[model samples]
Target: VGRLIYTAGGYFRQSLSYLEAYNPSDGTWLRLADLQVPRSGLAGCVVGGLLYAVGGRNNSPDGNTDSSALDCYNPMTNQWSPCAPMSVPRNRIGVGVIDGHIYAVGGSHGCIHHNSVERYEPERDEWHLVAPMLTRRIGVGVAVLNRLLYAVGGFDGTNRLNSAECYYPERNEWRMITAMNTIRSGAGVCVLHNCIYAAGGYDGQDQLNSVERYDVETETWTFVAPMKHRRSALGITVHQGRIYVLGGYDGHTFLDSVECYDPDTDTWSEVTRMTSGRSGVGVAVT
Candidate 1:
């Protein structure tokens, strides 16, 4: 497993450019290099052992369509470089790595929820369009396991969805999988110990503290223990045996409360809470 959780450039009060890093070994928070863009809802992922910052928006004029801008960072060099831009400027986009290529699923360009899916091939250094999702997704969560991509809960403009689907690269088709037990617009998803876990987000009507797990082999979802606080638009990272949940919204307000979930015990607990609110930041572990 990779050693550190890197989170950066969220939709913060001051349009902040800072990012935070944490070590699970000793629980030390390391300040990494600041982002080159002031972004919120960015698609951050690790592919081929490198970290990429993709499609996000600032509340400023420049954060509009130009938000399609992509940048890459090498933690090894503490340096950042420009990447080929995506075809769409997406905020709240879902991203993950499979094999070696990085995929970005549906996201919003302002109020528009996208059904578009795109992939970045490192050798080609550009985003190429792929098959669209079966449903439009805004503020969705994505995860990769066993070479397949799963798109979790999201808003389809009218409804808050509890729906889930899997993308099969073999046939280039997006098929509906077992739906999540709870609707999770803006929740966090990750694969751990061969199982996929879906954590905190807005249920249809309210912010939630609930968490759930999906077993691909059985095509089933089971509810797990609840979290300490309700949240939506949060991001997560897995290190060792623990899943670290970062900033999100609690319906009434923003949250910087960091919570950890342990699969071994099926428990959730709070560790450090931040003064600065972050309902929007993409998370990556490497």
Candidate 2:
């Protein structure tokens, strides 16, 4: 049994929700635990059976908006607790676990987009600064495959970028890779069958449904089936051989629609709609 959990944003209050588990045997959604925090545009990744939720922006009617907290949730216990705080506050950052450590990548820090990278070690409950990205970007789509982390196109303050790069833990460095065909930011990314896929995001002026794939072995980029609608600030995850794309803002309105991509068929299909429309969400699977 596999399941999906995500956060929703731009609501009156920040919130998190879980998709019902999909029983491969039957193919359906089974409800799960809700998140303790109600924040959106946060970063999430699974490390050692626990899901870690990082910083996100919270806008209120009072006109206050800023976040610098880190929370960890235990699905087995359905409980959350405070974790190590990030050195900097950021939202729409890239998060992934590599070599048993969690890496938090580029995102906006209130005033400007950042290229700084931070690594978290769970056993010691500490965060250490790593090499910064080659390019400064925010709202990037990131995925981990073959022990390497790939950061796709994103907003670089002045304009959306078509560039992509990867980080190598062993070298403690980042190197430029092939750029995406479409320049986008605030997209979703996930790894399936050793390949990295980047989904819906915003170009400079509009939302996009374009999807691109990077082959780790070939070091090449290829086109994939696009999503059902344009979106940005969405969440993507892989479970049981299927790629899932969750809630995001389509442009004019927030969205609750969920869709899945089948690599074998190279097709996209609608899945169960989420209970609420959300953008800037975080997603994880177990």
Candidate 3:
């Protein structure tokens, strides 16, 4: 709703409660109210002028706990307040907002991956189960285009998947779409110019720097210009027509670096880094 980009809880060595806001206008950042509880592998989105931090796992010194918590941030107050939680706890959840409703997609709880999906109605401050995905996924990338919710690749327990699918809210049905060329988990996904872009993620064998684009009209996937670094569990958001990919794991260490993809130029360029290295971070533009 404003000019700031918000990033929520994530992990370095352990889950963090850090919440920071970056202003692209000045390349400056400011610390914000911390989440009520730390989280990693969470998902974030804006609805009704509020930013919501959704489900993830808590990996604190106290214990490892899968979380189904939902907290909403009111910029006017700079505070986070608890809302109704999901029925199923999940980490690496993929979220998207449509018609003022937020959908929490595929993710995992402990060792069990979930295909179950849930929708949060802000008016009711409640979460209700919706149609599930066709495949169970962890670290899935989600985006909305042409009013349809798209869920791209992620780990399906035994292997990383190459498949993609979309949900039709009116019918409450999920239909499979053409798969990406590469099997990816934790790729940053977004929509631009009516096309869906899936960026750097980990294949089963290695972290990846390659990127792919899906043409919704043609229902086909093709390679796009790749990123400068291999990344997984990256935070991605579209700002001013550019896709900003933030901190993530590069197979070696957690990364604080940032990069932006310009669709007009079909290339990525360096941007100011984050204050701390993080992976499994949740990002939203407000």
Candidate 4:
């Protein structure tokens, strides 16, 4: 099967609507139409063969902003269409997919970070609020593995969180899960070979190069070899047996560097750099 990989919209000096796709077979990139609306901090995931971009920001630098916009992209047709909007505006969201649906988790709305949870059912073009998370997270990350959804670390206002949680769709409730070995937000988490990898982000005070792992069988998290750069809102994905880590902030500069992690070797190697540096660039692998 041919794999379709996408890295989409984010911020540089300002929020961007830019989106692109890469073809590994030919080693080329294709620029898609820019988003109809520009945003930063948006949550994106693949659902039912479409790229669904959830709520994010329009103006925050200029603090009070966010959105409830729900846009879907059909790669087969190269088109963008509107779906039902979220119940409430959000940005910096964590997203996970399962059972023909995508869930949008914790993110901030204007000055307030939220624990609000909602799901989009693509078949019906609708949104519904689910049980909110146990913690309010600003830069939350959600991954699906072992038939469960894991929501990873982010800021809770009171502190930079290192805690993690799991959601069971059967019960429609949230439960505590093993905390990540490190504290951070904006890190990307994904599963491969039944293990969960939490890659780079801010460690509360600064950008991080630390990464960690969790074995569902053991329910334990341990440190993994870190990536080369400190990325906060990176272009991250797992495809073809390797973890692909890309552009984000390195504390001072927006990075365009890309690297690959091979768990079989437990090492990270520089792959290739992105054409542009972006923070919070959305990614999808299929």
Candidate 5:
């Protein structure tokens, strides 16, 4: 891994295929190869030294067309190539890599919300169905801690969800965990200091600036210091000793700004802004 954070496709006016990397240490950006298919709401994760960009969709006046396409990027060669497509088209999806397998979680296609899940094997270049989540969710935030995949806070058809759950790979099942204090759909979820942190998202009423942390052993969530700006559909990843939250929607406009959270100080500070605003971007670290 090269200590670089990569952001895959996301939306500006519509879906975009642009791929770029940010160097955390130096606060610099490098343009990389684009995705084969332009998409928004996609998820990216690292597996076996490769960054995989999962499902999302492209929008048009007529309607929205979802994509089941998967693309893999090799940092060594600076190229992106096609890989096995998912069984179902998905947008606003959540993905995480566990035991060398990529798990694509809940998202939606058109008006249909999804509770379904699929696992991809790199060696086979194939995806297989896995147990579904109990509640259909779109814009879900997923993360892996201690080999368990955590699916947290999203829209479940009628309401913005505060409920969270975890998947047990050995049993191939999902179980509900303690719910977050605030309802957050499109929040950025990441693990730090052995805790799961869920940051800024949209409640039904408005974009949120609040954040929360979950104590896995206690199965409880508590509020943390809030962010300076309200954000939804943000890109987040933990690099070095800080958690970086990237470009997202602030209800009125798309944000090009970036912010970082230092656990030790329990505070957030600004970082260099991106080239352009992005919402529903896919972020992964290498």
Candidate 6:
């Protein structure tokens, strides 16, 4: 099977690109159309067959810069179009989709971390404010299962955090979930076979190679195998039963390396490297 992977430009830019296709059986890469807007640190979600690229730092070295503009891309047409903007600009936020709606979670807009949450309804092409998160954080990980959105560890501007939370759209409320064992930020998360897996990110002082898995049904987390190299601001997604971790920054250098994790054996192996080194890029599979 083949899947398309989308990525934003390297740090401090708004450029985005898509992998033409990847043959999972053979491990080969192909090229695809680039995004209309170049951006980095942006959050992305797939809903109603369109990929929504949300707010993130825009052409600024400072991580606090936020963009309120929303853009959507249709892979079938290889085209992009503008959508309704967010109420407030934000960056480094976690994003996911549930029940045909896209959710943007906690992150920062400027000097302060944000706890406010927002949701987009494609039918009306509008955004609505939802209950805020318990923790004000940026660089969090988000995933959805059974219509509930789960937000994982992130930094609170002052320090890294290990706490996690979930939002129930039906009740229009937020609920606390089991905290991560490790405090981290800039990690990547994806859902595979009903389990949510969190991958490489920063631990405040340094990049991390560790991985953790949470069971949606049991509401428990289990330690999993680590990545081959420590990374933060990486892109992770599940395709063809495997988890792929893309470019991210180590403490001293940005990475072009990529790796794959197999849950069946609880192990990781190196995969093909990306064409360019990047950090904080948005990634998605189709």
lDDT of 6 by residue, 1-286 (tens): 5566656544623434443345566766766566555666778777777777888766645653477768888878877888999988878878998888888888778787888889999999999999999888799999888888988899888889888888998998989899887888999888888888888888888899999989867888888999999999888777778898888899877788889899899989887887777788777777
Q: Where's the lowest-lDDT run of ten residues in candidate 6?
A: 12-21
TM-score for each candidate, following the candidate numbering: 0.94, 0.91, 0.97, 0.95, 0.97, 0.92
Clashes (candidate 5): 0
Question: For each candidate, what is the lDDT?
Answer: 0.82, 0.78, 0.90, 0.82, 0.90, 0.80
lDDT of 2 by residue, 139-237 (tens): 888889889888888877888898999999999899999888888898888889988888989887889898988887788888888889898988788
lDDT of 5 by residue, 164-230 (tens): 9999999999999999999999999988889999999998889988999999888899988898889
Better of 2 and 6 by TM-score: 6
Q: State, as a TM-score between 0 and 1, how close model 6 is to the true structure.
A: 0.92
Off by over 4 Å in 2: 2-36, 60-64
Show pairs that collide, candidate 3.
1-286, 2-286
Q: Stretches of candidate 3 above 4 Å error? A: 60-64
Residue 237 local lDDT, model 3:
90
Q: Write the per-residue lDDT of candidate 1 for residues 190-240, one digit (tens) a residue.
A: 888888888888877888888998997898999989999898888787877
Question: lDDT for model 2, on a 0 to 1 scale?
Answer: 0.78
lDDT of 1 at 130: 86
lDDT of 3 at 66: 85
Candidate 2 similarity to native, TM-score: 0.91
At residue 181, candidate 5 shows an lDDT of 90
